[PDB]
Fold this protein.
Amino acid sequence: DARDIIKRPVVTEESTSILDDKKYTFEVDTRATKTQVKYAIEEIFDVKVAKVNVMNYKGKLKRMGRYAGYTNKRRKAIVTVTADSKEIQF
Amino acid sequence: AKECVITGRKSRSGNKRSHAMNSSKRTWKANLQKVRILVNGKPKKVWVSARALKSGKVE
Amino acid sequence: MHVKKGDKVKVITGKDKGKSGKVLAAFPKKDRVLIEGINMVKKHTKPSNINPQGGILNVEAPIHVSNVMLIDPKTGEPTRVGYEVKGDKKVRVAKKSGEVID
Amino acid sequence: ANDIRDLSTTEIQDQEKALKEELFNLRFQLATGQLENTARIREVRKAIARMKTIVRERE
RNA sequence: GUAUGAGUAGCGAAAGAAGGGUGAGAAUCCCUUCCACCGAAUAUCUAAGGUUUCCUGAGGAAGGCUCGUCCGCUCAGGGUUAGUCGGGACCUAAGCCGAGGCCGAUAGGCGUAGGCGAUGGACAACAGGUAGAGAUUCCUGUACCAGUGCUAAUUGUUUAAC
RNA sequence: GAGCUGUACGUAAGCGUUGAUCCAGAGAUUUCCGAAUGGGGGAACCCACUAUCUUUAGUCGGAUAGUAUCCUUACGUGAAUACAUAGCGUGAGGAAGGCAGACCCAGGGAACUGAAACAUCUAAGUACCUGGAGGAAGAGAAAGAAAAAUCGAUUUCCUGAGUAGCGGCGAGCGAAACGGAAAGAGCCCAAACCAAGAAGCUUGCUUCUUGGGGUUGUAGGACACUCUAUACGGAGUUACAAAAGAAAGUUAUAAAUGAAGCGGUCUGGAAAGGCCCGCCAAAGACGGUAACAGCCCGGUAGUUGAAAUGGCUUUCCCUCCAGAGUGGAUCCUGAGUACGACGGAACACGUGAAAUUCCGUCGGAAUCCGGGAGGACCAUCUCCCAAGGCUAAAUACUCCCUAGUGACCGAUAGUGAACCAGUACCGUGAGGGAAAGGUGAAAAGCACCCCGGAAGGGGAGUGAAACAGUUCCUGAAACCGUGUGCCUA
Ligand SMILES: [Mg+2]
Ligand SMILES: [Mg+2]
Ligand SMILES: [Mg+2]
Ligand SMILES: [Mg+2]
Ligand SMILES: [Mg+2]
Ligand SMILES: [Mg+2]
Ligand SMILES: [Mg+2]
Ligand SMILES: [Mg+2]
Ligand SMILES: [Mg+2]
Ligand SMILES: [Mg+2]
Ligand SMILES: [Mg+2]
Ligand SMILES: [Mg+2]
Ligand SMILES: [Mg+2]
Ligand SMILES: [Mg+2]
Ligand SMILES: [Mg+2]
Ligand SMILES: [Mg+2]
Ligand SMILES: [Mg+2]
Ligand SMILES: [Mg+2]
Ligand SMILES: [Mg+2]
Ligand SMILES: [Mg+2]
Ligand SMILES: [Mg+2]
Ligand SMILES: [Mg+2]
Ligand SMILES: [Mg+2]
Ligand SMILES: [Mg+2]
Ligand SMILES: [Mg+2]
Ligand SMILES: [Mg+2]
Ligand SMILES: [Mg+2]
Ligand SMILES: [Mg+2]
Ligand SMILES: [Mg+2]
Ligand SMILES: [Mg+2]
Ligand SMILES: [Mg+2]
Ligand SMILES: [Mg+2]
Ligand SMILES: [Mg+2]
Ligand SMILES: [Mg+2]
Ligand SMILES: [Mg+2]
Ligand SMILES: [Mg+2]
Ligand SMILES: [Mg+2]
Ligand SMILES: [Mg+2]
Ligand SMILES: [Mg+2]
Ligand SMILES: [Mg+2]
Ligand SMILES: [Mg+2]
Ligand SMILES: [Mg+2]
Ligand SMILES: [Mg+2]
Ligand SMILES: [Mg+2]
Ligand SMILES: [Mg+2]
Ligand SMILES: [Mg+2]
Ligand SMILES: [Mg+2]
Ligand SMILES: [Mg+2]
Ligand SMILES: [Mg+2]
Ligand SMILES: [Mg+2]
Ligand SMILES: [Mg+2]
Ligand SMILES: [Mg+2]
Ligand SMILES: [Mg+2]
Ligand SMILES: [Mg+2]
Ligand SMILES: [Mg+2]
Ligand SMILES: [Mg+2]
Ligand SMILES: [Mg+2]
Ligand SMILES: [Mg+2]
Ligand SMILES: [Mg+2]
Ligand SMILES: [Mg+2]
Ligand SMILES: [Mg+2]
Ligand SMILES: [Mg+2]
């Protein structure tokens, strides 16, 4: 379930800025651990992972007229690869 | 669980009356004694009424 | 519905009574039909990516399907329709001329 | 669907793996902003689902 | 629903002034200078509690006891990184639950073994940098704790290293 | 059978006569919490153990299955303590929780109120709490009702009757049988005896199990003999024993077909309306369509249709089966039971002259030459046979599904809720609890010009209508204004 642990990449200004330091930002499902993310990345992309950091994000309250709800929760991972390794294109 | 194991009689409610016939609630209890009998091939202590005890059981 | 896309239509009631046209679209969920040259409206449209210049555009609007009758491909008069299973297909049949419309 | 039933229950899972890889690449392109036709997502998802259905009902 | 009281009471402790700017519009927004107030606080951290109020770009109907070009307000995008910090995977106090058990019209009450439960005990990381928003977490230097494999020597074999 | 990717516009990308979207039956998938069940927990979270496998150079990681408690049962181990039991372990079966705010059975059980005060009494075995259910429950085949003569298991309805009675004889409470109906159905044990086995040794005996036999009041059965009968016949899963399998039919859950006016003319934005002519009808139900339609549309009466699954009814299959008579030695026919005293309760019946039924506590029978009842009790007579069990229908109710109905409401009404309502909001919590429908037939929802930062206007245009302009049908009164005929310091 490597393709299930990793959902999609994250493309913002901060992630694009850190792309040059060999750090890649991904959205992962909310039950995966760091180790699972590391092994899923190494299997999908054929790189050598040096480190993974993770964080959790709550949903944001939103309104579109008389109706209020929340966006989805998110789990965000940053993966840094070793110096002697290829890169992910994005 | 406070009741006879043979002919399982226990407490029941009723009225206490006075002269002038005022009515109040009370209970009647059975006189269960704690005795050691053979519920199986083995003995044990149980509640048995004194009525169920005057012909038939083995103490 | 009783009228299909690509059919010939005689308009039975309304402001365009007595005219004829062709079915350009059908809306069975709301029970309307779009017919060429029939029931023209004028839309005041601001300039947009579609319609680059905008203006008073004269286009067509749907009408109710009950204001419509089929035109026989040969006799050429409005007919009620029946259904006859001829061969491996059920086909529509003109109920005046007693012939197959399809 | 009927041509899926002609496969030998081992190439079926190779097809499943290939479809999963294609679906992941499609979502990567959609996130990056480089996917032209988006109707492919539904097709791939339904194809995987029917592979799984046919494998399961063969037991 | 709408009057009268009535353009009346009030506008919630306090020092401001001028010159530039922006803008349709400025006592009220931005910048400069001068003046004034707190200073065992009206300063700096941090628990609780709140839950996106945080940053950036747009906005000015309503909210803000006045005004507003502004805002803790509206809209759209972002933002929270830990082997060592605080908690769990460690421990127990008050208290709570409680197999069997004891008691009792029913429902249940009490209680042993056992287990939960910090406000307490134990336990390994420091100094710098970071101009939109995180920092003992990221990065740069230099460490420590627990483990694992692989090498190289040493040593021990059931009066028995460990 | 031609469009489709919901509300829901739109953009984007696509799919369908090689038959999509859609409708009905049957399957597969079905995260986490919750009886929640591997352990814990502040709901949807945290942390495991045991087997088998997998990845890595190895720690690190991953997959699958099992792992709660109690009851019943089989096997195994096993203490004080010798045999043994308790305890411990494994396996196999079962339970647990919810609800339709209804209906019914049981355990427990108020007060306000009425009595023009109040305590007996009433309210009332009501409200409420708790436990068991079932599609119904409960009751039920006479130890009955009766009385110059009989009836023949229960239940429900009409009468009896506000009668007979009960009652600080106050307030009040209040039957039953006979008579008329709905519906109807009857049966298994225990015990005498037979046969077999086992335990104790009650030591040649009793007592335990299994099978057969047998269930009643004119007494019946065991027991003796006659007659027939072992499937000739009979019965059955709704009691009377219990579990299956086929075929035919019908019905339910999608559907198909289906007559007759584009008739002329007037008004109109539009004809289904008016006037003048036709037609269909086993079809003049209902709804829609630019105004009021049997003949425009969906349909309606009639006639058809089912691959699949469900229900019901028959037939087959399957399964199970002794019943008459004549006798009167001996034997059997429900024991701490029936009854009685004391204390209570239920009976319409408040202890009363109090029968009848039940509970607690004590005492305590007879057994066919026997026992119970007939409202204290005795004698006579009459009727019946307790202390074991099962049983359909007629009766009660509606969270639901299908088809309909109403001298029922019409947005302050009708549900609290016609609208994203048990929501917003209030409260620590249990809990309380709103307001809010209508453009137009069709968005044709006002291109363009002008004043203004915008909002908002004035034209122009659409429309039948804009004094219908996205709180939009109509648009009363209060209340706020502008203008003016007559009066007023
Ligand atoms: Mg890791
Ligand atoms: Mg975290
Ligand atoms: Mg978070
Ligand atoms: Mg975060
Ligand atoms: Mg009383
Ligand atoms: Mg006793
Ligand atoms: Mg005694
Ligand atoms: Mg006022
Ligand atoms: Mg100034
Ligand atoms: Mg906010
Ligand atoms: Mg304000
Ligand atoms: Mg003010
Ligand atoms: Mg401005
Ligand atoms: Mg803001
Ligand atoms: Mg930590
Ligand atoms: Mg622990
Ligand atoms: Mg420490
Ligand atoms: Mg080492
Ligand atoms: Mg799933
Ligand atoms: Mg739980
Ligand atoms: Mg638990
Ligand atoms: Mg958590
Ligand atoms: Mg492993
Ligand atoms: Mg044992
Ligand atoms: Mg021993
Ligand atoms: Mg239950
Ligand atoms: Mg129920
Ligand atoms: Mg009382
Ligand atoms: Mg009473
Ligand atoms: Mg009473
Ligand atoms: Mg109950
Ligand atoms: Mg049931
Ligand atoms: Mg019934
Ligand atoms: Mg019953
Ligand atoms: Mg009878
Ligand atoms: Mg009988
Ligand atoms: Mg008789
Ligand atoms: Mg009846
Ligand atoms: Mg028998
Ligand atoms: Mg005989
Ligand atoms: Mg005409
Ligand atoms: Mg006209
Ligand atoms: Mg007409
Ligand atoms: Mg009719
Ligand atoms: Mg009609
Ligand atoms: Mg007509
Ligand atoms: Mg006796
Ligand atoms: Mg008597
Ligand atoms: Mg008596
Ligand atoms: Mg009598
Ligand atoms: Mg009798
Ligand atoms: Mg019964
Ligand atoms: Mg109204
Ligand atoms: Mg409308
Ligand atoms: Mg309308
Ligand atoms: Mg201007
Ligand atoms: Mg304007
Ligand atoms: Mg008007
Ligand atoms: Mg109007
Ligand atoms: Mg008006
Ligand atoms: Mg008015
Ligand atoms: Mg005047």
